[PDB]
Design a protein around this nucleic acid. Structure first.
Lengths: 454, 454
RNA sequence: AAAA
């Protein structure tokens, strides 16, 4: 069900500290145990790098005894029922380190220089690839099977913690880390910091960036709820005014813009362009002020506790500026044609290349409505349709196939007695790709060049 | 252009140690300096937490003097060409970390034996949000205006390092980390591990997962090249036997499956389903064996250096198993309709809902071809078209609108003398979403229920 | 704050 994963470090350098989270204190010498008592996950998994403990039979059993040895030192009540419950799973490491030479699952001892000390087998040298370490931790997470993943990033090497964070990200883990000062001591009430929001904020930004790149709103993570809930407890004059502007950013108009583009509502997408231009012009202003605020963060201490205003979400939204152009609605539609081409939306690109010359034609004749009852449209459409069938036979063929899809007269499939269908034509993946990406612009530009003379 | 970023720690417990990267060798007391003369970047940014030091005038100048104070104790032999060109930028922190006092241009300190002990500030308490820290670091990265980002995750608090890693990810940074593992005692040759590949492998998996989720091949990160260029020099009989299978996984058939689905080649997508079923049935077998290999990684040390085989890339690909179903091509197309609905591909869902009942009808009559010359098709199409226009007027309307898009008779826009277009029907995002997500399946099931009696 |  709920599993706590933690990467192990050298316990001989641990002291009793009073870890804190929301006021619910936990007195221990390692953060993993504190988080166990707080969250109380059903399964606890500690990853121990081969860099640490080493023995003749079981390194996992030596680590279990190493922790109870530092529980017998400093006189701690726990580690008997706890370490018995913990599932110890060994992981690979890289670089040079010092391991411990245990006798028989019990770490050994030998007095060197000052007095009794663990005889560390100082040389350990292994060259491993971080993705080998990644694959080792991944397999543990995957086959472990949990409904809720909890990852402790407090203890362990910076290499293993970063690797563990990226594994956890693929299992929708909650991340925790409890950083402390160099040997604090008694009554050290250090805070456990949750990092879940930070890993989500970066995933959200990469998704927002790709959403504008591939003209898809399904990838745009809507931060409407975050901004609407955002409120300054204490606001210090013009740190209240700029937040008012940010809270009022129409992120819904951006999502709708991407929806219309994706779904082929080309006239609506283009009509929204000037509104969007004013949305991101304000967003540019807001972000410069917010950037300046966080660059001189010492003066805007009021934002120190805020979790709803994330700079990357807003900065990633500024990319939508690339989807915008200045000019008449025909020039805006012409730009959109190029956008569909780059984004590999073959269907929408071909339909726009077919219909835009009719509108171009209509404009030349003084205007009209896309309706069969309109004489100007009737003749304008007849001209572009017949000119396309006369010269650009390929354009018109790809258009109708993409428009009607597989189950259609355009593809001529055959349905049998058994309920099985055999395609009637070949789906030319690279020919469609090639035509749109290499000739649709050159062809369109020639069609519109001809229709200018009209 | 190329610029290095590092987060700072207490220079107090730092010893002069040699480093290693691509065979390069460099001796210093902190990894950031080693990486500086290894790569030689145009700018170097020193991110210093507010818990690190505290001066009456400039905390950045005290850190600048703190590092030269530690350089003096033993032979630093440097900082006359690295201490000039480094931009010190203060960052916020969290917790009860103990700060260290500063006065004008000096860090003070007192003897109290052991030579001259560090003047610990002793108590500091700040409760900040990790996204506030994230926004602070983001603003620094964003406004630094760099072409190539390089991030050092060796030094600093585990909270600040993980936060820095997620910021770096949004700037396409290369990540490096060199942990010590114990008492160095000079030299030791601590190795700097690059983590770029690990952060990319997880981003790639999230993209692969979303690609299957939204039926889009543009998001699927192709790992064919990795797989082909993968061959360990020494390989066991059981290792080779299963790696041979992995190297032969037809990831191209999965990408093509997603291409046909996105572009509406529904018959072809459905025909590929059985082939795909075998592709994933083997990939499951290989994943169980590889998972077992990485779970018992101590026996398969041949993989210890491999960077091409990423478990997450293959495991994420297994999600395509959800896109598959058993049954005749009509039953497979029926399932695909539900897939288009869940994926919010309104155009493809409505065209399939319109054409699938014609095929259903054709099957009942013993089969036929989707062609106007076929009598069975002619009548079958006439029946579903008239039944849809009779009972499901809405379905037929949304279908043609989405099929022809904005510039069409289906939307009736009006073109001006000025070249500006005013939409005709302005059909909303919600009316379309609600209809297909809430009614399309119930309506389709009733259409097919009726056509069974045929 | 290079196995808090």
């Amino acid at each position: 069900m709920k599993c706590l994963f933690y990467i192990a470090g050298d316990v001989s350098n641990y002291s009793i500290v009073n870890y804190e989270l929301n006021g619910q204190t936990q007195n221990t010498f390692f953060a993993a145990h504190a988080l166990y008592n707080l969250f109380k996950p059903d399964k606890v998994i500690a990853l121990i790098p081969d860099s640490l403990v080493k023995d003749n039979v079981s390194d996992e059993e030596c680590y279990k005894n190493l922790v109870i040895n530092r529980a017998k030192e400093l006189n701690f009540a726990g580690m008997e029922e706890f370490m018995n419950k913990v599932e110890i799973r060994k992981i690979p490491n890289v670089g040079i380190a010092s391991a411990i030479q245990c006798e028989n699952g019990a770490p050994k001892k030998e007095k060197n220089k000052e007095g009794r000390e663990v005889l560390k087998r100082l040389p350990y040298n292994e060259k491993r690839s971080p993705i080998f370490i990644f694959n080792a931790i991944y397999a543990i997470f995957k086959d472990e099977a949990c409904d809720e993943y909890l990852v402790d990033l407090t203890h362990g090497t910076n290499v293993l913690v970063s690797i563990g964070m990226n594994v956890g990200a693929l299992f929708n883990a909650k991340f925790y880390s409890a950083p402390v000062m160099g040997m604090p001591g008694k009554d050290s009430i250090v805070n456990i910091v949750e990092l879940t929001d930070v890993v989500q904020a970066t995933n959200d930004s990469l998704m927002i960036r790709s959403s504008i790149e591939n003209l898809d709103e399904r990838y745009f993570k809507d931060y409407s709820a975050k901004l609407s809930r955002l409120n300054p407890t204490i606001f210090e004059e013009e740190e209240k005014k700029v937040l008012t502007r940010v809270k009022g950013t129409d992120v819904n108009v951006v999502i709708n813009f991407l929806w219309n583009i994706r779904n082929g509502f080309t006239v609506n997408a283009v009509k929204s362009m000037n509104e969007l231009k004013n949305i991101i012009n304000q967003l540019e202003e807001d972000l410069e002020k917010l950037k300046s605020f966080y660059k001189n963060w010492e003066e805007h201490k009021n934002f120190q506790g805020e979790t709803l205003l994330v700079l990357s979400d807003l900065d990633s939204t500024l990319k939508v500026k690339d989807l915008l152009i200045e000019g008449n609605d025909l020039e805006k539609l012409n730009y959109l044609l190029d956008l569909y081409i780059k984004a590999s939306i073959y269907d929408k690109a071909l339909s726009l290349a077919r219909e835009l010359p009719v509108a171009i034609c209509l404009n030349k004749v003084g205007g009209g409505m896309f309706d069969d009852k309109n004489e100007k449209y009737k003749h304008c459409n007849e001209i572009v349709t017949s000119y396309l069938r006369l010269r650009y036979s390929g354009l018109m063929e790809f258009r109708n196939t993409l428009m009607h899809g597989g189950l259609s007269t355009d593809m001529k499939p055959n349905v049998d007695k058994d309920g099985n269908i055999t395609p009637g034509k070949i789906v030319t993946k690279n020919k469609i790709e090639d035509f749109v990406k290499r000739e649709l612009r050159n062809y369109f530009d020639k069609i519109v060049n001809f229709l200018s003379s009209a």
